[PDB]
Amino acid sequence: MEAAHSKSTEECLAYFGVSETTGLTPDQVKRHLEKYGHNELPAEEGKSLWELVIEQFEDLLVRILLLAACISFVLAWFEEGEETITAFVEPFVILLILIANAIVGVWQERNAENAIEALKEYEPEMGKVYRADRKSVQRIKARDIVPGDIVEVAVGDKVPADIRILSIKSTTLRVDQSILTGESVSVIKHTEPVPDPRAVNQDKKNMLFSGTNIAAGKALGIVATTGVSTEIGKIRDQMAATEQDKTPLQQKLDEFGEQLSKVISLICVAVWLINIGHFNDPVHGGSWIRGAIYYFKIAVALAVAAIPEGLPAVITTCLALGTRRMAKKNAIVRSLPSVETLGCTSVICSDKTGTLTTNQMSVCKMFIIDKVDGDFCSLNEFSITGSTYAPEGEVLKNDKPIRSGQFDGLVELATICALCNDSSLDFNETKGVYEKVGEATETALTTLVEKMNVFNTEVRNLSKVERANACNSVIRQLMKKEFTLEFSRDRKSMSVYCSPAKSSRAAVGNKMFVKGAPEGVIDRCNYVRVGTTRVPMTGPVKEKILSVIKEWGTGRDTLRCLALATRDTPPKREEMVLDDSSRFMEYETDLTFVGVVGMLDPPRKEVMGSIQLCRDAGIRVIMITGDNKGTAIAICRRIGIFGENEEVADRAYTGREFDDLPLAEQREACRRACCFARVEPSHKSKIVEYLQSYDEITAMTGDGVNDAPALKKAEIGIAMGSGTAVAKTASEMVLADDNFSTIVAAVEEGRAIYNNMKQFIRYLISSNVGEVVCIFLTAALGLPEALIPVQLLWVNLVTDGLPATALGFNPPDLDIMDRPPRSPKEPLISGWLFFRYMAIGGYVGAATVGAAAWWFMYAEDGPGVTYHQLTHFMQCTEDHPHFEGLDCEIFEAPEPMTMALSVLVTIEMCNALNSLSENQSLMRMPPWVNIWLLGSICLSMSLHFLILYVDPLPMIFKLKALDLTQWLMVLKISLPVIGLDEILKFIARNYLEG
Ligand SMILES: C/C=C(/C)C(=O)O[C@H]1C(C)=C2[C@H]([C@@H]1OC(=O)CCCCCCC)[C@@](C)(OC(C)=O)C[C@H](OC(=O)CCC)[C@@]1(O)[C@H]2OC(=O)[C@@]1(C)O
Ligand SMILES: Nc1ncnc2c1ncn2[C@@H]1O[C@H](COP(=O)(O)O)[C@H]2OC3(O[C@H]21)C([N+](=O)[O-])=CC([N+](=O)[O-])C=C3[N+](=O)[O-]
Ligand code: ALF
Ligand SMILES: [Mg+2]
Ligand code: NA
């Protein structure tokens, strides 16, 4: 039944045609069960390992490196006894890392906890219904419950489904709906309709939502909806079909790899417009199946020059190191990519309770009467420090510590708070902290009493376990609680009947201690207590009292206030009817006002600062809470989101208000407002979504189940360490420290990290540029294969794969957190750098093709065969006359390559010392800063030698160690690159902007 909250109890009964007195018939159940399904939440298992593997091959740069790897296995058959020693070494290494690294990725996806599973832990196994079947209440499996069912719930029960309340059996039904609001305070239910058909959960006080639990009372209800049609079901849906978007840096790569798909597929057809000459004149040397081998080889040579392999491992390494680094900062990163994404965060959406606050209701102010005289009435006001439930803090009078016991009024105030209370405090030995037991509102009173210690009880030598309720127990020993007149909606107050300890049931001196909403209690007072005396409540005293209550209730503090009173002459126990609550107000009459307490869930100490830092870094912070707007705004003012006196009419909304705004205005609202209150789970994800429609990298921070949809939706979900499993399972990070400040440092780490990736991502793609220039030249120019597709791989994995993971250690700026969020669209290479890396690209390209032709022509061992024939190496038999000087079968020897790869290596080792800074002269910025880079080159070079000396290696790479002569030239064809970019960095540092 949709909108069951808007209808009457009769209307809901009628709707399913069910009897509140008998319940559904076995037939009705059978039918409804068929129509509506089982009251359960669909489980959503993570994709099987098979999926996890297939997905690793969805990347274009991978499908290209695989498609080419196949063409390398196709043309791998053609290999006789001349080079049969290394026929299948490439088709092996090309698919080696292609799955070796592609499999390590599955070690970053199959590693995840399911959130819906965590969410299903709120599904109670059993439920209680009245079926026409039998007369007594049946306890059946919850999943067996269906709409129209007549369900029963009592204190302690976890609500089985979304239920419309029919009848409340106790004086009140108190509920904890924190899975939907994040607020633990008890909500008071009623059975009357709630007209507004757009009422938010907080407003449907006539409904019971699946997953919440009964704090007090007993009630009968009719099921409105089950399964995914419940409020917990909507949370469930927003976590199911969602799938996190792709990191900003990831899109940058997807763009690159997509353009690399057009460039390479164009370079090959570019050689076609250059091979329009050996097809005209009559000439053949083999079938097309033996002649077309040229094209399907220049492709398998570019696929290794273009696709910058090794990056997929340099990145994963940088992140892994960052993760461990942040982990020491108390930030558990569950998603490696998000690390980079947190760096460019512009907006931080934050839950309030338990996230911005401590979620420990605390009495921070209280007052009693000082003196009365005619129209004059002064109050003794006090303040209490401490923001946790721990009995640690002090009472201040004008900011100066005092002893509560000095004031008799505080002795009575403490007595009332200790007796008129159903809660207590406990010390959790395992966790080492104090925790409430019962209502937060009451435990604040319990804690207050301990801080006050009005009888000066000795507590410093008590174990923390025994310190928890020491002062309360003392007071409990002075008065015996006969019975308590529980809270009533028409009274807004509560009381307890007490008799002096060690007295007869007939003895005099019995008291009633009252606690409640100030207006009602104060109106039922005819006296005011002054110390241990009492005087008539007069107009002036009442006005003084109410005026301060008004202040404390709505300001920069906005506190929940309670008036405390006692009836000095209560009725005789006998003349009191306890089974009739409508008579309680009259018993709580002719009262003596005693005092007032004001409480609030206090902000965490390091939050106002964390937000100012965020501000400095250009990050805005928005609050989205399920709690009320009044306390929402007050907390915003306390932590710096709103000015202490700033006008917030248009800067703060409730979910209901927000829902009234038309779509376009809701959007704008998220850009203007900074405080959203009394919202629902879906409101949070919606606000985050709107924020993302303005192209903003938004983070969501919280601890509740109601925060899950937003945490999932945000680019960076951050859960509190002591928060719910659900919140944690939906986040990218967890602040095990619960410190908001840990978020600021995580951002810094994310900025520092990206800046260093920004370098090796370039250093690497840059290298892949020079490589393509080489293969392009030795393809349209005619020259032979200077570098084979089996060498490049080792170069872009070990040769460069080290200096890259070395730049990732470059010392970060000092003003990294004094600059605004970098744009999500900020490209890596463009402008003068696109041009700079363009020249350095061709350079290395012609520095390898020429370094090979050199060894042949103008060199040594190589025959001076001039260019006019050097390119006719494919004609050492078909045309001997115009080509015949030395041995023919010497081309594919370790000379042209062993002299072309020595350049790429020497050059790149130079490029690294250059990537140490975008626009900075190496002479200015000591190229020896990043010590690791130095050691990184010393390793890549010794590995370039080790791949020569130990024959077993150069046997496949086909390279022969040059002696102390040839190498002397190599260091002269690469060394000049240090001067080329050196001028480029001068043109950018002077004749350009920075
Ligand atoms: C891997 C190797 C190469 C050579 C490649 O094809 O890179 C191109 C390419 C795809 C881009 C280009 C390369 O394009 C050229 O250099 C022009 C063509 C020259 C042909 C010469 C004949 C042989 C990058 C590399 O280089 C220069 C020096 O201009 C810069 C940048 O890339 C980045 O910012 C890196 C993103 C990870 C991209 O324009 C990029 O395309 C994009 O979408 C970008 C925005 O990404
Ligand atoms: N329909 C209603 N309209 C307004 N207030 C209500 C309503 N129903 C209940 N309340 C009161 O509003 C509170 C929930 O919302 P916040 O604190 O965030 O504004 C409830 O807290 C107490 O009475 C409730 C209470 N109790 O439910 O048992 C007991 C109390 N006591 O005696 O200790 C005091 C209450 N109190 O508000 O002061
Ligand atoms: F703790 Al909240 F909205 F402030 F769930
Ligand atoms: Mg919370
Ligand atoms: Na997220």
Side-chain angles (χ1 to χ4, degrees):
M1 178 177 186
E2 193 176 306
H5 71 275
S6 66
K7 272 66 217 308
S8 72
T9 52
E10 297 87 1
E11 296 181 284
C12 289
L13 285 172
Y15 184 91
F16 295 93
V18 65
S19 173
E20 194 194 314
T21 82
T22 67
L24 298 182
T25 62
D27 177 65
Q28 292 178 291
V29 179
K30 172 274 194 64
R31 195 204 316 157
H32 287 327
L33 184 57
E34 301 180 305
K35 180 178 186 180
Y36 303 110
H38 286 83
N39 179 35
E40 201 163 14
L41 228 49
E44 187 178 69
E45 57 296 284
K47 296 187 298 180
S48 53
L49 188 51
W50 178 229
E51 308 270 300
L52 302 173
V53 178
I54 308 306
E55 51 187 55
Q56 301 294 177
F57 291 117
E58 301 182 302
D59 184 48
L60 184 65
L61 291 175
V62 174
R63 307 217 304 178
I64 292 178
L65 199 68
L66 183 68
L67 177 61
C70 296
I71 307 175
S72 172
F73 208 108
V74 174
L75 304 175
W77 284 61
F78 297 66
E79 182 63 294
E80 63 288 75
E82 67 126 359
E83 297 181 298
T84 180
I85 188 174
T86 60
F88 290 67
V89 186
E90 158 178 343
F92 178 65
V93 184
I94 189 63
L95 186 66
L96 198 173
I97 307 300
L98 210 173
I99 303 177
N101 199 306
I103 193 173
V104 181
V106 185
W107 198 67
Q108 300 166 53
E109 187 65 296
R110 190 180 184 68
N111 189 64
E113 306 169 296
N114 187 190
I116 301 72
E117 303 318 298
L119 188 79
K120 298 197 59 182
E121 296 194 296
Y122 292 89
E123 286 186 323
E125 191 199 300
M126 302 299 276
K128 296 179 279 163
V129 298
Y130 286 91
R131 298 289 191 59
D133 229 48
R134 42 258 306 178
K135 195 63 178 172
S136 67
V137 59
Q138 289 157 267
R139 291 171 188 267
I140 74 179
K141 300 285 188 174
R143 72 183 296 282
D144 285 349
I145 294 177
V146 301
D149 247 325
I150 282 201
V151 172
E152 183 181 70
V153 301
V155 60
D157 293 322
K158 188 187 301 176
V159 184
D162 284 13
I163 299 160
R164 207 310 192 166
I165 307 173
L166 292 177
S167 167
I168 289 166
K169 305 311 179 184
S170 37
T171 307
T172 56
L173 187 63
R174 273 121 136 169
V175 187
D176 158 38
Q177 318 197 309
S178 59
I179 63 174
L180 309 182
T181 73
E183 300 307 316
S184 73
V185 69
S186 281
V187 167
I188 296 317
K189 298 298 181 181
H190 69 74
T191 73
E192 296 302 286
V194 178
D196 191 324
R198 288 168 77 200
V200 302
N201 294 317
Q202 289 81 319
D203 288 321
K204 307 177 198 165
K205 300 168 178 186
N206 69 341
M207 299 287 287
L208 288 186
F209 308 93
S210 188
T212 63
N213 42 68
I214 310 298
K218 204 195 180 188
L220 197 55
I222 187 175
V223 181
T225 63
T226 66
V228 307
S229 298
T230 61
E231 285 301 317
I232 185 167
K234 300 184 184 173
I235 292 177
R236 187 281 164 190
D237 287 345
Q238 299 227 177
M239 292 189 276
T242 317
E243 172 251 304
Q244 194 76 298
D245 209 309
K246 283 199 174 184
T247 262
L249 175 55
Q250 294 182 180
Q251 293 180 64
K252 285 296 178 183
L253 303 175
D254 291 301
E255 196 190 13
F256 168 71
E258 190 60 292
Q259 280 303 71
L260 188 59
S261 172
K262 305 181 182 62
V263 178
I264 298 301
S265 61
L266 251 295
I267 289 297
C268 293
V269 186
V271 184
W272 196 96
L273 300 177
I274 305 302
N275 286 309
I276 309 176
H278 205 300
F279 183 61
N280 289 298
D281 56 60
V283 57
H284 71 296
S287 182
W288 286 65
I289 311 176
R290 181 183 180 183
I293 309 178
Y294 184 62
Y295 281 65
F296 279 59
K297 278 189 171 180
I298 59 178
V300 300
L302 290 176
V304 182
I307 299 172
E309 53 281 306
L311 181 58
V314 181
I315 281 179
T316 300
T317 298
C318 183
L319 274 33
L321 292 176
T323 300
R324 292 184 182 288
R325 214 173 318 155
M326 296 176 271
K328 299 201 66 176
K329 291 297 186 65
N330 282 307
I332 316 298
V333 178
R334 312 164 72 272
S335 182
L336 297 173
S338 70
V339 174
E340 171 255 309
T341 314
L342 220 186
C344 54
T345 297
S346 47
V347 190
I348 291 175
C349 286
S350 185
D351 175 57
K352 164 185 145 294
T353 303
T355 301
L356 258 32
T357 57
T358 70
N359 187 214
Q360 298 192 58
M361 196 55 60
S362 312
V363 179
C364 54
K365 283 183 181 182
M366 71 185 168
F367 75 77
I368 56 179
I369 309 300
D370 187 9
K371 78 174 284 188
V372 181
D373 190 70
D375 305 5
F376 171 73
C377 173
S378 60
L379 311 171
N380 260 325
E381 295 179 45
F382 302 83
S383 71
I384 344 287
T385 56
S387 47
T388 65
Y389 287 130
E392 303 166 2
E394 266 189 354
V395 184
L396 315 178
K397 183 56 158 58
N398 295 306
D399 292 302
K400 314 187 202 70
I402 68 279
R403 301 234 298 179
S404 293
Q406 302 304 73
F407 301 87
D408 287 338
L410 293 188
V411 171
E412 181 160 23
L413 179 151
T415 303
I416 298 173
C417 297
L419 298 187
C420 189
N421 188 158
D422 292 321
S423 309
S424 64
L425 193 69
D426 185 74
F427 182 71
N428 184 306
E429 290 173 292
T430 308
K431 291 199 177 189
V433 295
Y434 289 88
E435 313 184 308
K436 71 184 174 70
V437 176
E439 255 291 72
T441 290
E442 291 199 308
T443 300
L445 265 44
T446 303
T447 296
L448 169 60
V449 174
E450 294 304 305
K451 287 169 180 184
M452 289 173 78
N453 199 346
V454 298
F455 290 112
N456 320 285
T457 293
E458 199 50 46
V459 303
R460 70 179 306 295
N461 297 298
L462 293 169
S463 61
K464 287 185 172 185
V465 164
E466 204 181 326
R467 166 77 259 246
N469 295 284
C471 306
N472 281 272
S473 292
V474 175
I475 289 173
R476 272 180 267 109
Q477 297 291 281
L478 288 170
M479 298 286 276
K480 173 203 171 184
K481 188 188 301 186
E482 305 278 10
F483 55 88
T484 135
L485 292 175
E486 67 289 343
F487 170 98
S488 157
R489 285 240 302 181
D490 57 63
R491 233 195 329 168
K492 285 171 173 294
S493 74
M494 166 198 321
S495 64
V496 294
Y497 196 106
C498 301
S499 55
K502 307 185 176 187
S503 71
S504 291
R505 306 189 77 259
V508 189
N510 288 174
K511 300 298 169 184
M512 270 173 78
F513 299 120
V514 196
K515 172 183 68 170
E519 182 178 302
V521 170
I522 286 166
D523 283 310
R524 306 199 293 281
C525 289
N526 289 334
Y527 307 107
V528 148
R529 184 134 291 138
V530 187
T532 60
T533 68
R534 170 243 277 194
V535 301
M537 171 70 74
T538 58
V541 179
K542 188 173 203 164
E543 270 203 301
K544 217 305 139 57
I545 289 178
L546 295 179
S547 86
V548 180
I549 302 302
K550 201 63 180 179
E551 273 178 40
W552 288 13
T554 50
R556 300 162 60 181
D557 53 46
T558 299
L559 309 176
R560 201 172 312 191
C561 293
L562 282 61
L564 304 170
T566 83
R567 199 222 258 249
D568 300 322
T569 310
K572 295 185 181 303
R573 180 201 332 286
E574 307 73 57
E575 39 194 49
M576 290 179 77
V577 185
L578 309 189
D579 74 55
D580 187 4
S581 74
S582 96
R583 284 169 60 62
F584 295 175
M585 190 178 98
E586 180 56 39
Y587 298 139
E588 298 183 355
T589 272
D590 197 36
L591 314 178
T592 301
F593 174 87
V594 170
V596 163
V597 290
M599 55 179 95
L600 79 333
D601 164 26
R604 297 177 174 290
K605 191 175 182 180
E606 74 300 335
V607 182
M608 175 174 254
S610 303
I611 293 175
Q612 180 54 232
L613 293 187
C614 282
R615 188 170 280 136
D616 290 327
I619 307 186
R620 78 182 286 235
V621 170
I622 290 174
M623 181 199 280
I624 307 178
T625 190
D627 198 0
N628 300 321
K629 183 150 81 171
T631 112
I633 288 171
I635 290 303
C636 280
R637 296 186 194 280
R638 278 189 168 69
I639 63 178
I641 285 185
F642 280 150
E644 297 54 61
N645 295 299
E646 183 191 321
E647 180 71 0
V648 305
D650 57 334
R651 310 197 61 193
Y653 297 86
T654 66
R656 263 273 30 184
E657 295 173 357
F658 186 84
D659 277 347
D660 271 329
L661 300 183
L663 279 49
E665 302 189 2
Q666 299 191 319
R667 189 158 185 292
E668 175 58 27
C670 302
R671 217 176 62 187
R672 184 219 320 143
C674 277
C675 176
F676 290 82
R678 204 164 217 277
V679 313
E680 301 185 313
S682 68
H683 285 124
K684 302 204 185 195
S685 43
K686 195 196 304 180
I687 294 170
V688 170
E689 180 179 8
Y690 279 141
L691 250 31
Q692 295 176 317
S693 66
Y694 287 98
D695 287 45
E696 283 187 290
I697 274 50
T698 80
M700 173 55 188
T701 185
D703 67 328
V705 175
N706 59 318
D707 292 311
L711 284 166
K712 196 130 190 178
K713 187 112 248 298
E715 268 92 33
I716 321 161
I718 306 166
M720 297 297 268
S722 70
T724 58
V726 178
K728 289 175 191 174
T729 64
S731 301
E732 276 63 273
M733 306 184 176
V734 176
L735 313 181
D737 192 57
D738 276 345
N739 233 214
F740 215 72
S741 52
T742 298
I743 283 163
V744 175
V747 173
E748 185 176 62
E749 184 66 51
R751 287 183 173 188
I753 295 294
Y754 182 76
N755 288 335
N756 286 33
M757 290 183 78
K758 201 177 189 64
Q759 291 309 66
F760 71 66
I761 290 287
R762 290 167 169 174
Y763 163 66
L764 249 62
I765 301 293
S766 187
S767 176
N768 290 73
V769 181
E771 280 174 41
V772 179
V773 180
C774 168
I775 300 299
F776 187 64
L777 293 176
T778 61
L781 200 63
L783 291 72
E785 300 164 55
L787 293 164
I788 60 175
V790 194
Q791 299 173 301
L792 297 180
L793 287 178
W794 204 84
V795 188
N796 310 321
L797 283 169
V798 185
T799 310
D800 309 306
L802 291 171
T805 306
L807 292 177
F809 283 115
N810 305 334
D813 267 295
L814 313 180
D815 68 302
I816 185 63
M817 292 304 280
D818 288 42
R819 189 177 186 184
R822 67 188 181 68
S823 169
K825 304 303 177 182
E826 174 182 294
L828 290 167
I829 305 294
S830 71
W832 185 255
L833 179 53
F834 184 105
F835 170 68
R836 174 167 61 174
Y837 281 176
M838 188 66 271
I840 310 302
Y843 173 74
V844 185
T848 51
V849 176
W854 177 89
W855 182 247
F856 280 48
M857 307 180 270
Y858 175 63
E860 293 298 300
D861 306 298
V865 183
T866 56
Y867 179 63
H868 196 292
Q869 44 178 295
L870 169 58
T871 57
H872 305 63
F873 69 88
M874 183 193 95
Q875 308 171 61
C876 212
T877 61
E878 62 174 60
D879 193 300
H880 292 289
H882 197 61
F883 195 65
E884 191 61 296
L886 286 67
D887 196 302
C888 274
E889 195 171 305
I890 301 297
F891 287 116
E892 290 191 299
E895 275 58 60
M897 306 180 282
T898 310
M899 186 60 108
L901 185 62
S902 299
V903 192
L904 188 64
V905 174
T906 305
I907 289 183
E908 292 312 306
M909 298 308 103
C910 294
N911 205 197
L913 299 170
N914 296 178
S915 294
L916 284 170
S917 183
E918 183 173 297
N919 305 303
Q920 269 284 299
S921 309
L922 280 72
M923 184 180 275
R924 174 61 177 179
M925 186 174 279
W928 56 81
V929 169
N930 188 307
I931 305 303
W932 280 71
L933 183 62
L934 295 175
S936 178
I937 307 179
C938 293
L939 174 58
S940 294
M941 287 299 251
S942 65
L943 283 173
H944 184 52
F945 289 160
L946 176 64
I947 190 178
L948 303 173
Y949 276 56
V950 185
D951 181 61
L953 301 179
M955 187 174 100
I956 51 180
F957 286 78
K958 300 190 298 180
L959 300 172
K960 197 169 187 178
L962 318 178
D963 208 3
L964 301 176
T965 305
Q966 318 166 67
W967 185 271
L968 298 174
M969 190 70 268
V970 185
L971 300 176
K972 300 292 80 176
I973 305 303
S974 305
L975 210 296
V977 76
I978 302 300
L980 170 55
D981 209 61
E982 192 58 292
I983 305 301
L984 290 164
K985 292 183 178 179
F986 190 74
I987 303 301
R989 76 175 217 178
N990 298 298
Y991 271 71
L992 276 175
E993 182 195 302

